[PDB]
Amino acid sequence: ATFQTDADFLLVGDDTSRYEEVMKTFDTVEAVRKSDLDDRVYMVCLKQGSTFVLNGGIEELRLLTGDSTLEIQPMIVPT
Amino acid sequence: ATFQTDADFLLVGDDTSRYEEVMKTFDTVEAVRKSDLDDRVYMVCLKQGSTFVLNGGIEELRLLTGDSTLEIQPMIVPT
Numbered sequence: 319a320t321f322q323t324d325a326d327f328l329l330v331g332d333d334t335s336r337y338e339e340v341m342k343t344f345d346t347v348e349a350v351r352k353s354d355l356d357d358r359v360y361m362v363c364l365k366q367g368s369t370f371v372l373n374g375g376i377e378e379l380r381l382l383t384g385d386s387t388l389e390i391q392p393m394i395v396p397t
Numbered sequence: 398a399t400f401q402t403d404a405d406f407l408l409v410g411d412d413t414s415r416y417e418e419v420m421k422t423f424d425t426v427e428a429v430r431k432s433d434l435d436d437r438v439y440m441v442c443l444k445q446g447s448t449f450v451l452n453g454g455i456e457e458l459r460l461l462t463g464d465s466t467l468e469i470q471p472m473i474v475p476t
Contacts, residue, residue, distance in 0.1 A: 325445060326445065348405075348442065349428070349430070349442075351428075363427065363428070363442065365474070366404060366405070366445070366474045367474055367475070367476050393445075395445060395446060396446070397446045
């Protein structure tokens with residue numbers, strides 16, 4: 319279940335109401351942005367060199383946010 | 398007089414009118430946010446793995462911005 323990433327990442331889901339609010343609870347997050355073109359899409363920027371980790375996995379974030387469709391897509395980039 | 402920072406940085410000046418649009422022309426800037434701590438202040442986020450470079454030094458950025466009082470303060474972090 320454990321989810322880990324050293325990069326920014328997209329948050330996609332069918333119900334993004336509380337996304338911005340729970341994300342700000344993680345110390346590793348510099349900021350969160352919402353696409354103005356599509357409500358399902360958010361970008362989560364991470365502090366420099368930090369590692370976002372969910373011991374409970376995507377699932378822990380689905381519970382905190384209430385969206386069981388919530389998914390994450392890492393931006394992934396070489397250094 | 399070359400200026401370089403691998404980290405996000407603060408922009409501080411007395412005429413912050415074109416800070417937003419001038420910073421968004423650099424290919425290393427992920428985002429530029431206006432501090433709500435005070436209006437003389439902006440935060441500039443560097444893309445992961447990127448280096449922000451002004452060949453002219455902070456003077457080059459003061460011209461581009463039209464603010465001779467502009468100051469820069471690179472943010473912190475330990476890899």
